[PDB]
Amino acid sequence: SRVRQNFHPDSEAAINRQINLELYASYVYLSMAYYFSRDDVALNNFSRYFLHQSREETEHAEKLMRLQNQRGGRIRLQDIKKPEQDDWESGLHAMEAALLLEKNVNQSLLELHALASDKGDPHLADFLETYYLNEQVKSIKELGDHVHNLVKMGAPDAGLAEYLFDTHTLG
Amino acid sequence: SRVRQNFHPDSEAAINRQINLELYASYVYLSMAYYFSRDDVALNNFSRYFLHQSREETEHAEKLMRLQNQRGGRIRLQDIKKPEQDDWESGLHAMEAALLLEKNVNQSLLELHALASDKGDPHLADFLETYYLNEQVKSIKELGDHVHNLVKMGAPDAGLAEYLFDTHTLG
Amino acid sequence: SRVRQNFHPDSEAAINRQINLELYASYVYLSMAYYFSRDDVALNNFSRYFLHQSREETEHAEKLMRLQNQRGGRIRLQDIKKPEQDDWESGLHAMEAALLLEKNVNQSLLELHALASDKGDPHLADFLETYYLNEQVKSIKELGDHVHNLVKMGAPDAGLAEYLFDTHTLG
Amino acid sequence: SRVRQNFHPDSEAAINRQINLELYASYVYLSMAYYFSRDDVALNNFSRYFLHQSREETEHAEKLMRLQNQRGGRIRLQDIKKPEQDDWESGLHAMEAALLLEKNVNQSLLELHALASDKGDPHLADFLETYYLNEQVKSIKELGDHVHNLVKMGAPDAGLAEYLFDTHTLG
Amino acid sequence: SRVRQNFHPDSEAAINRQINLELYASYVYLSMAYYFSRDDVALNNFSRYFLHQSREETEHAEKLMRLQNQRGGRIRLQDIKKPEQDDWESGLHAMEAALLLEKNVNQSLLELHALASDKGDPHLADFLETYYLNEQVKSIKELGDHVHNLVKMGAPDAGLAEYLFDTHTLG
Amino acid sequence: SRVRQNFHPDSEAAINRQINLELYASYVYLSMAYYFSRDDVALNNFSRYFLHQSREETEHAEKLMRLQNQRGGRIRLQDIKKPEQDDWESGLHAMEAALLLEKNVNQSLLELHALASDKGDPHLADFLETYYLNEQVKSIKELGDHVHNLVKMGAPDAGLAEYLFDTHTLG
Ligand SMILES: [Mg+2]
Ligand SMILES: [Mg+2]
Ligand SMILES: [Mg+2]
Ligand SMILES: [Mg+2]
Ligand SMILES: [Mg+2]
Ligand SMILES: [Mg+2]
Ligand SMILES: [Mg+2]
Ligand SMILES: [Mg+2]
Ligand SMILES: [Mg+2]
Ligand SMILES: [Mg+2]
Ligand SMILES: [Mg+2]
Ligand SMILES: [Mg+2]
Ligand SMILES: [Mg+2]
Ligand SMILES: [Mg+2]
Ligand SMILES: [Mg+2]
Ligand SMILES: [Mg+2]
């Protein structure tokens, strides 16, 4: 590529793997979003919350795809694995699953950053720091907040907990 | 499901298959969109066009997921298969692939409609007719228009064709 | 902490020490601010300048406290040491003391950054670079400018110097 | 000091002690504020409430520093002691600690007022009455209200109490 | 310098060399801009495009000069070498020359970043990442896009190519 | 050149030399501008003043480059020589150097005008008179004003002079 400069094939590959992971995260959140609009779940603000997260993950994927193009890498898409469950069990369980997902995505981003650093790719390093690392920290913190509140409120067994959390925190 | 009424498990299954197909179509268009943003393709309005199509396909998927929940079905997500190519070769080839994709999706929707009709599910039948069947016809027609113009203009070999089509038709 | 990820206890501790240092800097500037509104100093724009700096330092402290929470660290507050003087002697001396303070805070931030780097904490590294390192450089530069002008103008002995600097530069 | 008039050195000293106490109160509230932003507390309106209180205490400190300068006293800053805890245990416990803090600050202000009265300093007496004594009464009353509601609602053990109090009263 | 802190003389020198390189890039683009407004070239949007790039390069130079001052370095200006050609041959050739120039400038910036990293200057590292590295990637990508389109369109020999590219892409 | 008319190659050459001189003047002013932003100079309105002059010189250069193209001449760029100093010593010395620079540029413009007149090029003559000769007179007068005031005020040794001149005249 006539634009490619200081862009290691390993970084290119890792970016492609990260693209897939971001798409996967979008899919997970999409699944959660539509779990919460089931008639036997019907937590519309959980649904909206995860829908929003899903679209944010798509933007995360797209920024990496743009990065790949900008750097002269070649996007290599892979299957977006279905989420691990279709029944996310409860608002709390979904929040906990999302928290685990974000920490896993964060770990992947940190490994990607270590790779960028190993390859002396400050542009990639900065790209991750600018657009992903703090977004991950904020997302993990937010999910942590949500998990704690839901746990403290007695979710999922306390019938009012997820309902009230849905209307107040996620409203 | 206490909302489920006149909703055949075959229709539920076919809706889940259609959800996956719509997600797949979104993915195909996403791949195309970022193919045209490659430095060695750089047809930004092809890119935008397919990006828009990608997001519309996501809405197609979501409406079916909404339908599933509305009818008391249970969304069953599957892997979103990667698109058949990462290199979409040219604006014309991408348009032709999109055309083939839309006709395939249309065939799936028509089969879904035949199933809805077979199962006496007028709500599902109307749902497809209202939101999918004409949208598919419109999309197939548009892609056909685009394919014809690109062919007529000499794409992909005529160097000005895809460039001018990008700026004029997709602008 | 269920949010804690790639966050070394040393970094957590260093952030707590930095929080204290930022609070200390706020206090120093608060002291300076109210030194300059003494009836026998009465340099109201020196006062406002240092008051503004004081509040900025509080925001610096708060961002680190937020960082601590975001990363799952536990804020550990310590006494905010009183400033080294209550009588800041002159506009020039206060500016020079502030300059020294900022360079000391900068050194602490650079050590914190080296620690983040040593611990492979790019989020923390980026956090410091994004919110502190350049703010420090700009603050040190500004104080350097102020010190130079005050020195060149003949502060503190030239009776018009701090007065005119107060009204023009700090106005 | 050419402005000093009817300003007893005891009052000057007591004002300096009160400045420190107000700064200390600010610090206590700052600690509480960021306690409630912990991922395992995550009561954002408790956090905001105490943050607001913290900044109000800083204004309390500053008005006394202003008073010191206005009267020709000399501000003598002391270490701002760290708050007694970094872990404020619960919204209720923090409210109760804040209540105790405000009554302690109020006692100090009342002693300061008695001193002002003993020294025939009506300006200082009026200053305290105008800006501190009723503010303290209001603050103590508000915290008492909050404590009662939290207790009545079952805080901290009733999982919904602090959550609902956070969203409704502190919202 | 009383502001100088953690600023290695090598970094200072490298910044001065980078200032010159940025000024040089501005000059190259200025030359290109006025090449395209020759009566026998007369591609006014190529001209405007390179004029814009020229002024952007001046801002790149100025930010480095400001950085030098901010850090306490001493700007040391050198001759701005004339561009390698006055006759830039064609829109395509100018775009290709600009692409090569940007990659060369990028290489210099990456070397500067490696130096900053070697010298443990995170402020300088962040400065380059924040203001230069991604700007370079975007500029190289854009020029790559432009080069590809011009090549594909048949520039410079296809008489309509640069004309149409001028009006559509650079308009 | 099919536009070239009554345009002597000597005039073309002299215009190219004048372009370089205007670029050089821009560079001198750029150097001065960033000299006054040094932490040990810190005369921000001197800095702004010379920065403005620098950009005006670039416009002077560009109008001549425009003229060259308009007349069918061929721009021949040369190295832009670095300014004679990086340390401009004082606001007064910089003003005096700028004054000398402008008179030198003016002399070059007057020689260019004499050449235009010798070659019977009234368009070039008018071009210089319309856009350069009075601008030079105005600039030389302004710098003379500034030099006189700075001298009269006691610059550079009177510590308040350049400071006050910076804030009042250059503000
Ligand atoms: Mg993501
Ligand atoms: Mg496969
Ligand atoms: Mg599987
Ligand atoms: Mg569709
Ligand atoms: Mg029908
Ligand atoms: Mg600070
Ligand atoms: Mg202690
Ligand atoms: Mg002590
Ligand atoms: Mg780094
Ligand atoms: Mg108070
Ligand atoms: Mg009374
Ligand atoms: Mg540049
Ligand atoms: Mg030389
Ligand atoms: Mg040469
Ligand atoms: Mg000029
Ligand atoms: Mg005449």
D52 touches chain C (CB under 8 A): no
Residues 8-37 of chain F with CB under 8 A from chain C are none
Region for residue F103 given its phi and psi (left: phi exceeds 0; alpha: psi -120 to 50; beta: otherwise): alpha
CA distance linking residue D46 with residue D92, whole number of Å = 10
Could you count the other beta carbons within 10 Å of the beta carbon of residue F37?
Answer: 24
At F117, the amino acid letter reads S
Instruction: Give CA D113 to chain center in angstroms.
Output: 17
Spatial neighbors of F168 by CB under 8 A, at least 6 apart, are none
Query: Which of C105, C15, C125, C112 is closest to C53 using CA atoms?
Result: C105
B69 touches chain A (CB under 8 A): yes
Query: Which of C47, C46, C49, C54 is closest to C27 using CA atoms?
Result: C54
Containing D159, the helix (H) or strand (E) segment is helix D159-168
Q: Ligand 13 centre from F27 Cα, in Å?
A: 13
Chain A residues with CB-CB distance to D160 below 8 A: 153-154, 158, 160-161, 164
CA distance linking residue D93 with residue B24, whole number of Å = 53
Residues 104-123 of chain D with CB under 8 A from chain C are none
How close are the terminal C-alpha atoms of chain C, in Å?
48
CB-CB contact of F19 with C122 (8 Å): no
Residue numbers in the known binding site of F for Fe cation are 22, 57, 60, 102, 136
Residue B79 to residue A74, Cβ atoms within 8 A: no
- Among B34, B40, B92, B150, most E C-beta atoms within 10 A, so best to mutate, is B40
Spatial neighbors of B132 by CB under 8 A, at least 6 apart, are B60, B109
Angle between helices F159-168 and F134-153 (to 10 degrees): 140
- The alpha-carbon gap from E78 to the nearest alpha carbon of chain F, in Å, equals 5
Size of chain A in residues: 171
CA distance linking residue E102 with residue E134, whole number of Å = 12
Q: Ligand 9 centre from E121 Cα, in Å?
A: 10
- Among E5, E63, E75, most C C-beta atoms within 10 A, so best to mutate, is E5
CA distance linking residue F23 with residue F12, whole number of Å = 17
Chains in contact with F, where contact means 3 or more Cβ–Cβ distances below 8 Å, are C, E
Cα dihedral C121, C123, C129, C133 in deg (nearest 10): -60
CA distance linking residue C104 with residue C124, whole number of Å = 19
Query: Which of F149, F171, F170 is closest to F161 using CA atoms?
Result: F149
Chains in contact with A, where contact means 3 or more Cβ–Cβ distances below 8 Å, are B, C, D, E
Residue A40 to residue B1, Cβ atoms within 8 A: yes
Chain B residues with CB-CB distance to E160 below 8 A: 160
CB-CB contact of B82 with A77 (8 Å): yes
Chains D and A touch (3+ CB pairs under 8 A): yes
Of C144, C168, C169, the CB nearest to F39: C144
Spatial neighbors of A62 by CB under 8 A, at least 6 apart, are B30, B34
CA distance linking residue F42 with residue C146, whole number of Å = 8
At C26, the amino acid letter reads S
CB-CB contact of B124 with B11 (8 Å): yes
Query: Which of B93, B98, B84 is closest to B41 using CA atoms?
Result: B93
Residue numbers in the known binding site of C for Fe cation are 22, 57, 60, 102, 136
CB-CB contact of D155 with D92 (8 Å): yes
Parse chain D into domains and list their residue ranges: 1-171
Query: What's the reported resolution, in angstroms, to a tenth?
Result: 1.9
- Among E110, E131, E132, E137, most A C-beta atoms within 10 A, so best to mutate, is E137
CA distance linking residue D91 with residue D14, whole number of Å = 32
Q: Which residue has the tokens 């979904």?
A: A94
Give SS3 for C88: coil
- What's the number of CA atoms in the CB half-sphere (13 Å) around residue F46? 29
CA distance linking residue D117 with residue D134, whole number of Å = 17
Query: Which of B171, B107, B98 is closest to B139 using CA atoms?
Result: B98
Residue D38 to residue C69, Cβ atoms within 8 A: yes
Instruction: Give CA E64 to chain center in angstroms.
Output: 13
Positive or negative: CA dihedral B46, B48, B52, B55: positive
CB-CB contact of D22 with D64 (8 Å): yes
CA distance linking residue E64 with residue E55, whole number of Å = 14
Residue A103 to residue C5, Cβ atoms within 8 A: yes
B22 is in an annotated binding site: yes
Region for residue F72 given its phi and psi (left: phi exceeds 0; alpha: psi -120 to 50; beta: otherwise): left
CB-CB contact of F112 with F18 (8 Å): yes
Of B39, B160, B167, the CB nearest to E144: B39
Could you count the other beta carbons within 10 Å of the beta carbon of residue C80?
Answer: 27
Could you count the other beta carbons within 10 Å of the beta carbon of residue F144?
Answer: 15
Question: How far are the Cα atoms of C37, D25, D105, D109, D143 from residue D137, in angstroms, in the given order?
Answer: 30, 15, 11, 11, 10
Angle between helices E44-71 and F9-35 (to 10 degrees): 30
A168 touches chain B (CB under 8 A): no
DSSP state of C82: P
Angle between helices A44-71 and A9-35 (to 10 degrees): 160
Identify the closest residue of chain C to F42 by CA–CA distance. C145
Chain C residues with CB-CB distance to A107 below 8 A: 5-6
Method: X-ray
Question: How far are the Cα atoms of C31, C47, C50, D7 from residue C35, in angstroms, in the given order?
Answer: 6, 7, 10, 19
D39 touches chain A (CB under 8 A): yes
CB-CB contact of E72 with E1 (8 Å): yes
CA distance linking residue E118 with residue A77, whole number of Å = 36
Q: Tokens in use for E74?
A: 């001493």
CA distance linking residue A53 with residue A32, whole number of Å = 10
- The alpha-carbon gap from A129 to the nearest alpha carbon of chain B, in Å, equals 23
Positive or negative: CA dihedral B70, B74, B79, B81: negative
How close are the terminal C-alpha atoms of chain B, in Å?
48
Residue A106 to residue C6, Cβ atoms within 8 A: yes
CA distance linking residue E35 with residue E31, whole number of Å = 6
Backbone angles phi, psi at B80, to 5 degrees: -90, 110
CB-CB contact of C83 with C57 (8 Å): no
Q: Is the peptide bond before E156 cis (omega within 30 degrees of 0)?
A: yes
Cα dihedral A27, A32, A34, A37 in deg (nearest 10): -170
E60 is in an annotated binding site: yes
CA distance linking residue D2 with residue A25, whole number of Å = 70
Alpha-helical regions (H) of A36-90: 44-71
CB-CB contact of D72 with C38 (8 Å): no
Residue D42 to residue A160, Cβ atoms within 8 A: no
Residue C131 class from Cβ within 10 Å (0-12 exposed, 13-18 middle, 19+ buried)? Answer: middle
Q: Which residue has the tokens 């003494």?
A: C38
- The alpha-carbon gap from A43 to the nearest alpha carbon of chain D, in Å, equals 18
How close are the terminal C-alpha atoms of chain A, in Å?
48
Identify the closest residue of chain C to F36 by CA–CA distance. C145
Q: Is the peptide bond before F156 cis (omega within 30 degrees of 0)?
A: yes
> What is the number of the ligand closest to the CA of D54?
10
Alpha-helical regions (H) of B72-121: 91-118
A3 touches chain E (CB under 8 A): yes
Chains C and B touch (3+ CB pairs under 8 A): no
Positive or negative: CA dihedral F10, F15, F17, F18: positive
Chain E residues with CB-CB distance to F76 below 8 A: 86
Could you count the other beta carbons within 10 Å of the beta carbon of residue E123?
Answer: 26
Chains A and B touch (3+ CB pairs under 8 A): yes
CA distance linking residue F99 with residue F112, whole number of Å = 20
CA distance linking residue D82 with residue C23, whole number of Å = 11
CA distance linking residue F144 with residue F167, whole number of Å = 18
Backbone angles phi, psi at C156, to 5 degrees: -90, -5
- Reply yes or no on domain C1-171 having CATH 3.40.50.2300: no
Chains C and F touch (3+ CB pairs under 8 A): yes
Query: Which of C43, C34, C52, C47 is closest to D70 using CA atoms?
Result: C34
Instruction: Give CA C160 to chain center in angstroms.
Output: 28
Give the 3-state secondary structure of F38-63: CCCCCCHHHHHHHHHHHHHHHHHHHH
Of A39, A65, A68, the CB nearest to B69: A39
